[PDB]
Scaffold this active site. Structure first.
Site, PDB file in Angstrom:
ATOM      1  N   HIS A   1      29.888  10.091 -48.975  1.00 54.41           N
ATOM      2  CA  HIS A   1      29.280  11.425 -48.720  1.00 54.41           C
ATOM      3  C   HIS A   1      29.617  12.393 -49.852  1.00 54.41           C
ATOM      4  O   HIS A   1      30.148  13.457 -49.577  1.00 54.41           O
ATOM      5  CB  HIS A   1      29.690  11.975 -47.366  1.00 54.41           C
ATOM      6  CG  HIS A   1      29.023  11.291 -46.230  1.00 54.41           C
ATOM      7  ND1 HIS A   1      29.680  10.377 -45.450  1.00 54.41           N
ATOM      8  CD2 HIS A   1      27.762  11.380 -45.751  1.00 54.41           C
ATOM      9  CE1 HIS A   1      28.862   9.954 -44.504  1.00 54.41           C
ATOM     10  NE2 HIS A   1      27.675  10.552 -44.670  1.00 54.41           N
TER      11      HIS A   1
ATOM     12  N   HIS B   1      25.453  10.888 -53.505  1.00 58.20           N
ATOM     13  CA  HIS B   1      24.631  10.803 -52.274  1.00 58.20           C
ATOM     14  C   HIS B   1      23.624  11.959 -52.262  1.00 58.20           C
ATOM     15  O   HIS B   1      22.403  11.700 -52.061  1.00 58.20           O
ATOM     16  CB  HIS B   1      25.522  10.752 -51.037  1.00 58.20           C
ATOM     17  CG  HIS B   1      24.772  10.836 -49.753  1.00 58.20           C
ATOM     18  ND1 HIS B   1      23.934   9.844 -49.330  1.00 58.20           N
ATOM     19  CD2 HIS B   1      24.759  11.777 -48.788  1.00 58.20           C
ATOM     20  CE1 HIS B   1      23.431  10.169 -48.149  1.00 58.20           C
ATOM     21  NE2 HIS B   1      23.894  11.358 -47.807  1.00 58.20           N
TER      22      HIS B   1
ATOM     23  N   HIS C   1      22.527  18.868 -48.067  1.00 60.09           N
ATOM     24  CA  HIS C   1      22.527  18.401 -46.653  1.00 60.09           C
ATOM     25  C   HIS C   1      23.910  17.920 -46.206  1.00 60.09           C
ATOM     26  O   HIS C   1      24.133  17.851 -44.982  1.00 60.09           O
ATOM     27  CB  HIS C   1      21.449  17.336 -46.424  1.00 60.09           C
ATOM     28  CG  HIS C   1      21.844  15.954 -46.832  1.00 60.09           C
ATOM     29  ND1 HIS C   1      21.831  15.543 -48.142  1.00 60.09           N
ATOM     30  CD2 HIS C   1      22.232  14.884 -46.092  1.00 60.09           C
ATOM     31  CE1 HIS C   1      22.212  14.271 -48.199  1.00 60.09           C
ATOM     32  NE2 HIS C   1      22.468  13.842 -46.946  1.00 60.09           N
ATOM     33  N   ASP C   2      24.804  17.563 -47.118  1.00 62.37           N
ATOM     34  CA  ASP C   2      26.160  17.067 -46.738  1.00 62.37           C
ATOM     35  C   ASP C   2      27.254  17.882 -47.465  1.00 62.37           C
ATOM     36  O   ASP C   2      28.374  17.366 -47.669  1.00 62.37           O
ATOM     37  CB  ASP C   2      26.302  15.577 -47.064  1.00 62.37           C
ATOM     38  CG  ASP C   2      25.825  14.583 -46.016  1.00 62.37           C
ATOM     39  OD1 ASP C   2      25.934  14.846 -44.817  1.00 62.37           O
ATOM     40  OD2 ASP C   2      25.425  13.493 -46.427  1.00 62.37           O
TER      41      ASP C   2
ATOM     42  N   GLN D   1      24.830  -4.726 -39.727  1.00 61.52           N
ATOM     43  CA  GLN D   1      23.680  -4.329 -40.575  1.00 61.52           C
ATOM     44  C   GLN D   1      22.356  -4.694 -39.880  1.00 61.52           C
ATOM     45  O   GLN D   1      21.478  -3.806 -39.828  1.00 61.52           O
ATOM     46  CB  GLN D   1      23.830  -4.892 -41.987  1.00 61.52           C
ATOM     47  CG  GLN D   1      24.971  -4.253 -42.781  1.00 61.52           C
ATOM     48  CD  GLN D   1      24.810  -2.759 -42.927  1.00 61.52           C
ATOM     49  OE1 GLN D   1      23.952  -2.275 -43.661  1.00 61.52           O
ATOM     50  NE2 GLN D   1      25.623  -2.016 -42.189  1.00 61.52           N
TER      51      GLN D   1
END
Ligand SMILES: Cn1ncc(C(=O)N2CCC2)c1C(=O)Nc1cn(-c2ccc3ccccc3n2)cn1
Ligand SMILES: [Mg+2]
Ligand SMILES: [Zn+2]
EC number: 3.1.4.17
Length: 313
Positions: A68, A72, A106-107, A269
């Site tokens: 993060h 990213h 966004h993060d 996954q």
């Protein structure tokens, strides 16, 4: 004004494709972002002096966590760039300005921990924002950086246009909360299938924008297999750190966050591509057909994880 950013030939061509990897040279990422804003938005959208000061403040407020992180942020902005460029006439001038900034931001100030761990830790942010905890924080961080002297890239919008863009960015960032995605995509599916989907309906555009945000956020699953596989290591490095912290609180983590269950990653996954990624890109392709390359790359990567389970890698 007459100043364009230009990329080297291979980047200038590859940046237009959904599966583009931004590379390991951190110092090129700000220029890659400005390039994408100029082609997607115009060389007029932002004062370059202010945009550059905004970008560098955003970079400083991303932390040195395995996943993060600032890479990213720029990766997620590129996927949105690719969606916007393959869908020229579908989006407003405001939406194209807001959404790339939304993706970059966004993060903001992520510590590498889920909303769950904050709540169980009893972190101050979980008292301030009882749901979408980190995402309300990311939007608050975005507003604070915009209000730094010389950082308001939106200053030349009108009062009403400024309010609309900040509301686009708020909804876009809240929607990256994966807990909200399941309901959002169900409603988009019901609407497209009964044929009630109406892109003049603001509440409908919000839902579609939110699905684009999930699609961009998850885009590691849409890369060449080596990029997808090497990003998975960064993703699990955080999850397993979170599980360690859960064990320190005396809670057994869910298997996803238990480094003792490294073995089960391939099967986790499959569940994630089938439960989350594939339905996300399927509904996105139904609503915006030119984003089909994301669905195709995602399916290719599911087949690669199937190959790891069968021991063929
Ligand atoms: C690839 N990718 N990109 C984004 C995310 C994500 O969710 N993010 C939120 C922050 C980014 C993921 C992801 O891996 N999600 C995921 C993995 N699993 C599982 C489930 C069971 C498992 C059992 C054993 C071992 C591993 C396991 N893993 C469930 N969900
Ligand atoms: Mg997030
Ligand atoms: Zn993200």
């Amino acid at each position: 004004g007459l100043m364009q950013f230009t990329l080297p030939v291979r980047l200038c061509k590859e940046i237009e494709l959904f599966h583009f990897d931004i590379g390991p040279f951190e110092n090129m990422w700000p220029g890659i972002f400005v390039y994408m804003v100029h082609r997607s938005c115009g060389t007029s959208c932002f004062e370059l002096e202010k945009l550059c000061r905004f970008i560098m403040s955003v970079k400083k407020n991303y932390r040195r966590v395995p996943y993060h992180n600032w890479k990213h942020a720029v990766t997620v902005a590129h996927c949105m760039y690719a969606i916007l460029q393959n869908n020229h006439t579908l989006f407003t001038d405001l939406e194209r300005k807001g959404l790339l900034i939304a993706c970059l931001c966004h993060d903001l100030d992520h510590r590498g921990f889920s909303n769950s761990y904050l709540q169980k830790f009893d972190h101050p942010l979980a008292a301030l924002y009882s749901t979408s905890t980190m995402e309300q924080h990311h939007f608050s961080q975005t507003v604070s950086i915009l209000q730094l002297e010389g950082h308001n890239i939106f200053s030349t919008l009108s009062s009403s246009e400024y309010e609309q863009v900040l509301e686009i960015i708020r909804k876009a960032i809240i929607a990256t909360d994966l807990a909200l995605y399941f309901g959002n995509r169900k409603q988009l599916e019901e609407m497209y299938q009964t044929g009630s989907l109406n892109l003049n309906n603001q509440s409908h555009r919000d839902r579609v924008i939110g699905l684009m945000m999930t699609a961009c956020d998850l885009c590691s699953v849409t890369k060449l297999w080596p990029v997808t596989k090497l990003t998975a290591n960064d993703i699990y490095a955080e999850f397993w750190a979170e599980g360690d912290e859960m064990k320190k609180l005396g809670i057994q983590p869910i298997p996803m966050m238990d480094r003792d269950k490294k073995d089960e990653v391939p099967q986790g996954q499959l569940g994630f591509y089938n439960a989350v990624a594939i339905p996300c890109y399927t509904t996105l392709t139904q609503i915006l057909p030119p984003t089909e390359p994301l669905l195709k790359a995602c399916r290719d990567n599911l087949s690669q994880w199937e190959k790891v389970i069968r021991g063929e890698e």
